[PDB]
């Protein structure tokens, strides 16, 4: 059970950019492989990944530095430990780096080891990853937030919001929900190609048609739901990622809906906008509806909509338990988006999920634009009985691999598997 | 060790459509999981993919029948066997099916089992898959045939042909080759974005920029090659998929270059065009140059070009060992695309590859429109020392996964690994 080898290597992510991969071997023969997704090389409160910056190689995006760190620094510091001591190992790697950003060794280097280790252990004990991470009572399959229509900067159309997602809350199981989202996804692709719109896909694997406004985004999605055979009421609901920081002007102090063409709006106006969109559409979740610094505005948004709408904070909290408690106290938002490579280790991730839960908040495990076949976040979702997950559209293996993995979990879980659907929003008092 | 369990389930492929997955366990605990890919379309001579045809579920694309076949028919037949008995097991399933196109049990069902068993056996023997399949002397990393530009039916632009690809033949090792094509893939993306063109990708993770000229696609790549810092003709030769059958006049005997608008062209002059293209541009390989039936025509093309240019037949042979032989007699090609699921079993697959080698033909193991995280075709390329592989662009994990596996393989090989680059074309007299 004692780690006898920790070896990193450079590989590619779903976007053609190098990333790290770590393999841990125990003396018994147990193996574990951790693959890290594309994080950020810069952030004030965000853990930072380590890039080489060699303009001549991979456009400076190589991670030969992080690999070297793992193989020559982290490896010998970890070799000797018992693969099962997750907490102790992450604690060390964190102290070895010695910095909060994990800037010395690199968050990508630390995370790959953290994950490989955990997987190595699961393997050693011959148990599924989700049981090894969360215990015996790990059975609630996440209700997915599926990307379907893209806008803002992740598109070239008239839609200010970054992305529109569908949530199959009316399904009896994850498997059916998956089927539900897939049939809608296709019904829609049909509506677009027949409407003359582009059908190619982006990073999340969703559509980025050139719709005319924001309303034409939700509306077209409603069409697909109905064409697919499901009712927009109970079968499929709506979720969105506004990513308002994108169309927010620090200097002007207002939000500017360029793409939409609706001009500029005030935070009071934006909160009003969301109130209009929510009455006209079955929107259950709004992500980063106000700028990452509008701490005051989020509080108001939370007061008016928080009772019947999930307000998620992505750029707002940056998986930083620090900022999370700041929001919890002030009472801003009621759900946090968890990005593993953004925090750094598995134990820190779990700590965040627990702090969130204890606040009556929701923890939406998430993916990044540059993913890999690794589906560790799916086991995490089930190991913590999170209740939801946001891992992409129903295209591209970098996204499907996570859904296929949830199928297996639901499958090997048998008659004890659970799908809460709408009953997953324990954070929403009113319906 | 005796096979104790053979279990299949319905999962999703990279395009969001259901496919089959099979797990194999042996008495001592060895395990193996095979995932089956799927093509955009299919016809005769191609092993049958069993679909449920239930229009009210996944557009009638569910594979619940095949899942049942493996669990209810195949499992009972194979359990008891020694996981290492590949040939025997693949022969047992073929007979069990009875039909020549595996249409009774389904080629997706059979293949899933075939792959699962072999991987389960490598696991059992604690040896890398490429070694279990091809023996001790497996060390040639494939020269990749990377997708960059798309045309024909796979796009909404001119470009009569449906696929242009780059081949990093000048790199010293597969690792570098991958970096090379990656820098080119991105360099191109920079060019397309700049001149206002679609940066979105297709099934293979390639680009579908709207261009009005077959020659444009060739020259637009030549500049991405150079701007990436590489010298064409030496570091990056070119390969193309014509898929001429798509634009072949069923009635009359001509090819209509509708997309490019060049109008009608006859198989007698199409050869001149291909002979032209290869004159100005660095075209090393042309896939399906003439119609999948214009045999007589292909022959001619093989004489005038087949000694300095690889002519691989995809639709021509459709991974059919019988069609192939015919082509070998007439001398109408010098390379064949290998699509595992198009034939159905790993055994028949290796038989097809060995039969090509003996004819001085090249065996290009390729990916499929609908893929999964599975990278078995990667090990197959090295196991047989094929020398080439066509598994996609440098976007989408359904593609990148295969490349990462190759990275892993080369690494594992160490000092005995080999990358032949241009010299992989043993089928070409002149270079
Ligand atoms: Mg977002
Ligand atoms: Mg073809």
- Return left, alpha or beta for A83; rule: phi > 0 is left, psi -120 to 50 is alpha, else beta: alpha
- Which is it for strands A163-167 and A237-241: parallel, antiparallel or unpaired? antiparallel
Q: Which of A12, A59, A182 sits opposite B12 (nearest CB)?
A: A182
Residue A325's Cβ-count burial label (10 Å; 0-12, 13-18, 19+) is middle
Contact B333, B294 (CB under 8 A): no
Measured from the Cβ of residue B76, the count of other Cβ atoms closer than 10 Å reads 11
Nearest of A53, A401, A273 to residue B404 by alpha carbon = A401
Token pair belonging to A248: 């927010």
Catalytic residues of A, by residue number, are 204, 339
Cα gap A152→A160, rounded to integer Å: 4
**Is the CB of A179 less than 8 angstroms away from the CB of B401?**
no
DSSP B209-220: ---S-HHHHHHH
Q: What is residue A324's three-state secondary structure?
A: helix
**At CA B19, angle to CA B288 and CA A175, rounded to 5?**
150
Token pair belonging to B77: 């037949």
Chain B residues near residue A408 by CB distance under 8 angstroms: 9
Crossing angle for the helix pair B107-125 and B346-357, nearest 10 degrees?
Answer: 90
Cα gap A348→A101, rounded to integer Å: 13
Cα gap B427→B358, rounded to integer Å: 11
- Contact pairs from chain A to chain B, CB under 8 Å: 111
**Which residue in chain A has the smallest CA separation from B371?**
A397
**Is the CB of B58 less than 8 angstroms away from the CB of A407?**
no
Interface of B with A (CB under 8 A): 9-17, 21, 56-59, 178-179, 182-183, 185-186, 198, 200-202, 208, 229, 371-373, 394-398, 400-401, 403-404, 407-408, 411
Query: Distance, CA B288 to ligand 2 centroid (Å)?
Result: 6
Class of domain A127-430 (CATH, top level): alpha beta
Query: Distance, CA A240 to ligand 1 centroid (Å)?
Result: 8
Cα gap B392→B368, rounded to integer Å: 9
Contact A398, A151 (CB under 8 A): no
Domain boundaries, chain A: 2-126, 127-430
Place of tokens 């045939």: B145
Q: Is A54 annotated as a binding residue?
A: no
Catalytic residues of B, by residue number, are 204, 339
Chain A residues near residue B58 by CB distance under 8 angstroms: 179, 182-183
Cα gap A97→A129, rounded to integer Å: 27
**Is the CB of B407 less than 8 angstroms away from the CB of A11?**
yes
**Is the CB of B56 less than 8 angstroms away from the CB of A407?**
no
| Beta strand ranges found along A332-372 (DSSP E) | 336-338, 363-366
Q: Is B300 annotated as a binding residue?
A: no
Q: Which ligand is nearest to the CA of B342?
A: 2
Nearest of A205, A147, A396 to residue B392 by alpha carbon = A396
Measured from the Cβ of residue A157, the count of other Cβ atoms closer than 10 Å reads 22
Residue B263's Cβ-count burial label (10 Å; 0-12, 13-18, 19+) is exposed
Q: Is the CATH number 2.40.10.10 carried by domain A2-126?
A: no
Phi, psi for residue B274 in degrees, rounded to 5: -65, -35
Half-sphere exposure in the Cβ direction for A203 (13 Å, CA): 20
Query: Could you tell me which residues come within 8 angstroms of residue B226 by beta carbon, excluding any fewer than 6 positions away?
Result: B232
Q: Shortest Cα distance from A105 to chain B (angstroms)?
A: 23
Query: Distance, CA B367 to ligand 2 centroid (Å)?
Result: 12
**Is the CB of B12 less than 8 angstroms away from the CB of A58?**
no
Nearest of B219, B321, B337, B329 to residue B285 by alpha carbon = B337
Cα gap A1→A329, rounded to integer Å: 42
Cα gap A153→A131, rounded to integer Å: 39
Cα gap A259→A253, rounded to integer Å: 18
Crossing angle for the helix pair B376-383 and B346-357, nearest 10 degrees?
Answer: 40
What is the layout of strands, in order, in the sheet containing A163-167? A146-150, A163-167, A237-241, A283-287, A310-312
**Which residue in chain B has the smallest CA separation from A18?**
B179
The terminus-to-terminus CA distance of chain A in angstroms comes to 48
Any bridge partners for residue A287, and if so which? A241, A312
Alpha helix (H) ranges present in A126-195? 129-134, 174-195
């Amino acid at each position: 059970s004692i780690i006898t080898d920790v070896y990193a290597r450079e590989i590619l992510d779903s976007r053609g950019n190098p990333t790290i991969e770590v393999e841990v071997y125990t003396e018994s023969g147990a193996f574990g492989r951790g693959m890290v997704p594309s994080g950020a090389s810069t952030g004030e409160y965000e853990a930072v990944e380590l890039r080489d910056g060699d303009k001549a190689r991979y456009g400076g995006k190589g991670v030969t530095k992080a690999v070297d760190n793992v193989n020559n620094i982290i490896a010998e510091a970890i070799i000797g430990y018992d693969v099962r001591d997750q907490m102790a190992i992450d604690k060390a790697m964190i102290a070895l780096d010695g910095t909060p950003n994990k800037g010395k060794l690199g968050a990508n280097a630390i995370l790959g080891v953290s994950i490989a280790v955990a997987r190595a252990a699961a393997d050693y004990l011959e148990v599924p990853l989700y049981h090894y991470l969360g215990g015996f009572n790990t059975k609630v399959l996440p209700t997915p937030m599926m990307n379907i229509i893209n806008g803002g900067s992740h598109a070239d159309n008239s839609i200010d919001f970054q992305e529109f997602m569908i949530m199959p809350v009316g399904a009896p199981t994850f498997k059916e929900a998956l089927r539900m989202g897939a049939e809608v996804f296709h019904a829609l692709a049909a509506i677009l190609k027949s409407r003359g719109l582009a059908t190619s896909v982006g990073d999340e694997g969703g559509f980025a048609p050139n719709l005319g406004s924001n309303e034409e985004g939700f509306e077209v999605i409603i069409e697909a739901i109905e064409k697919a055979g499901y009712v927009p009421g109970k079968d499929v609901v709506l979720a969105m990622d506004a990513a308002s920081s994108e169309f927010y002007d620090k200097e002007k102090g207002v939000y500017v809906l360029a793409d939409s063409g609706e001009g500029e709006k005030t935070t009071d106006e934006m909160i009003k906008f969301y109130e209009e969109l929510v009455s006209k559409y079955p929107i259950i979740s709004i992500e980063d509806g106000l700028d990452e610094n509008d701490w005051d505005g989020f509080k108001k948004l939370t007061d008016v909509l928080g009772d019947k709408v999930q307000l998620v904070g992505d750029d707002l909290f940056v998986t930083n338990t620090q900022k999370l408690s700041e929001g919890i106290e002030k009472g801003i938002a009621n759900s946090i988006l968890i990005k593993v490579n953004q925090i750094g280790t598995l134990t820190e991730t779990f700590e965040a999920i627990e702090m969130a839960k204890e606040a009556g908040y929701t923890a939406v495990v998430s993916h990044r634009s540059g993913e890999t076949e690794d589906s560790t976040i799916s086991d995490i979702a089930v190991a913590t009985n999170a209740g939801q997950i946001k891992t992409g559209s129903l295209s591209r293996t970098d996204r499907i691999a996570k859904y296929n993995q949830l199928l297996r979990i639901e499958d090997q879980l048998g008659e004890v598997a659970e799908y809460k659907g709408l009953k997953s929003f324990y954070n929403l008092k009113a319906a």
